[PDB]
Amino acid sequence: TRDFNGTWEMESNENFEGYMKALDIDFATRKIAVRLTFTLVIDQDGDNFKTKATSTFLNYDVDFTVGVEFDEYTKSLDNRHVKALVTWEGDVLVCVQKGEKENRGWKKWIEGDKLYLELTCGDQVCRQVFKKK
Numbered sequence: 001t002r003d004f005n006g007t008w009e010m011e012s013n014e015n016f017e018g019y020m021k022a023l024d025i026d027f028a029t030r031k032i033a034v035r036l037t038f039t040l041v042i043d044q045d046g047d048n049f050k051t052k053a054t055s056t057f058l059n060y061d062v063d064f065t066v067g068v069e070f071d072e073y074t075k076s077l078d079n080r081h082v083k084a085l086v087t088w089e090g091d092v093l094v095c096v097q098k099g100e101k102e103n104r105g106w107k108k109w110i111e112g113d114k115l116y117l118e119l120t121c122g123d124q125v126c127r128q129v130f131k132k133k
């Protein structure tokens with residue numbers, strides 16, 4: 001399936017700290033962020049995605065169109081400029097954030113009712129799993 005619509009509640013989180021440290025996120029923010037769960041809300045209409053991940057503290061809020069590159073300021077996260085592009089590799093949704101950091105981006109896919117997220121920066125991979133509400 002290429003349909004990621006839903007409210008996705010966090011089931012699993014592995015190595016979020018390594019990903020954030022590879023982005024050089026300030027220590028106090030990273031130490032608080034690694035403790036906190038969050039919910040991922042995806043509104044998808046064709047190529048058009050609105051995604052938002054909300055925790056009691058931090059924010060993640062990105063809208064994009066599959067196949068359309070966009071210049072992105074990463075704002076609240078690590079305050080960097082990247083050229084972001086989201087495409088399909090089969091049923092895996094792949095994002096590359098071209099810029100200073102190597103191997104920066106993510107992959108999302110659905111495997112037996114659960115949403116998998118792999119966040120990558122440099123040699124660090126964070127894996128998260130969510131269940132659909």
Ligand SMILES: *C/C=C/c1cc2ccc(N(CC)CC)cc2oc1=O
Pocket residue numbers: 033038040051053054055058059060077106108117119
């Ligand atoms: C494709 C989904 C990406 C994604 C990336 C994220 C980056 C940072 C954060 N937080 C917690 C709200 C700040 C440390 C969350 C987040 O969720 C995602 O789904």
